[PDB]
Structures are given as structure tokens and as C-alpha cells.
Amino acid sequence: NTIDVYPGKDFGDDDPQYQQALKYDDLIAIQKQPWVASATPAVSQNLRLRYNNVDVAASANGVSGDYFNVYGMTFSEGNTFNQEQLNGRAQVVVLDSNTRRQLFPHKADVVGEVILVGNMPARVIGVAEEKQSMFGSSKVLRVWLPYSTMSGRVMGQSWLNSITVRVKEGFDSAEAEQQLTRLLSLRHGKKDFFTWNMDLEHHHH
């Protein structure tokens, strides 16, 4: 009914070698299948975070900030983006627990710190805790900014977190998922991704 496609083998696989599994050309190929109503990517930008002498690759996502709820992430410090930050395109950032450890190993509190997100300074407004979330903790360094702040900023190189494929009404969704899987295995020469098929009504994330 809707089918998510994810890179790698298991939930939580965002290691470097999996980030490039799903291609824009794959999205376009899916989009042309006759059983597909629509197919949408979720995209991160890879950039570098700079704080003092730390300079590290990270994946940044622009989110709408009900985002943390729907994935089961809570905040160990600070909070999610408020309405003015979202409307105002504010230069503010939420850290994952890996990023927080990397940049601020010693600090008791990091809310109010400023980091460079690529070439854009951003005030840290919270730290998200991923360990009890749907997919567990990241294997890489993740940050989140307001979607509006990210839109039109070419902050770095994009990769596909996932592709969500809506199946046309009345089509057999198990067979759809099998066709999707054949299509992509053939384009890749292997099964380096996995799928999660569900009721549109349950796709709350």
C-alpha cells in the first residue's frame, strides 16, 4: 500500500558504505512503474561540522519537527524546533547523541553552543536520544535543522535515506513489493536494500 525502501541490511544501517545504495536514477525508475501512484525520497546532506579543533563529516536532515515524535526520539537536553524557528528559517540545530559526544565530550550542557554546520553557524537547541527510537542509534553523526532553513541551501552532497513508494489502489501490494525488489536488485546487481510494506493508514512516520 505504501512500501519504504531503505539502504543496507537491517534497520539502523546508515554506515558510509550504505549511504550511496539508493540512487536518484532508482527513484526515477520506480516512478515509471505502472503500479506506482507516487514515489518520494527522503534526503540527507553530507557536510562537515566544525567546533573548535573538531572537523567531522555528518549527515544533516531538514525536518518539520514533529519528526522526533514519529520516530520515538526524545530529548536528553533542550527541545525540538519551535514555531518561530520553523517559520523564521532559524540557524539552529539539534544534535544526535553521537554528534554530541564527538563535538562536546566534556561539557555537561551544550544548549546554546554554536557550531559550524558546513559554512553556516547554528545555535545548538537540543540533543535527541535515539536509543529507544524505531531504528535505534545512528552509526554516523547526525544533525537536524528546520526544513525551511535547509531548503535551497546547498549545504553538501545529498544521499537517499529512503524512498517511499505509494502503490496504486487495488493493486496486489505483496507482488508490488516483489517487483520493486526485483527492479532494484537488477539495477544494483545485488540486494543492498530492504523494504517495509504497510497500510498507508499506519505510515505515521
UniProtKB/Swiss-Prot annotation:
Membrane topology (Periplasmic): 1-199
Task performed by this protein: Part of the tripartite efflux system MacAB-TolC. MacB is a non-canonical ABC transporter that contains transmembrane domains (TMD), which form a pore in the inner membrane, and an ATP-binding domain (NBD), which is responsible for energy generation. When overexpressed, the system confers resistance against macrolides composed of 14- and 15-membered lactones but no or weak resistance against 16-membered ones. In addition, the system could also transport R-LPS or a similar glycolipid.
Subcellular locations according to the entry: Cell inner membrane
Lineage: Bacteria, Pseudomonadati, Pseudomonadota, Gammaproteobacteria, Enterobacterales
Quaternary structure and partners: Homodimer. Part of the tripartite efflux system MacAB-TolC, which is composed of an inner membrane transporter, MacB, a periplasmic membrane fusion protein, MacA, and an outer membrane component, TolC. The complex forms a large protein conduit and can translocate molecules across both the inner and outer membranes. Interacts with MacA.
The protein's name in its UniProt record: Macrolide export ATP-binding/permease protein MacB
Protein family according to the UniProt entry: Belongs to the ABC transporter superfamily. Macrolide exporter (TC 3.A.1.122) family.
Shown part of the complete sequence: 310 to 508 of 648
Originating gene: macB
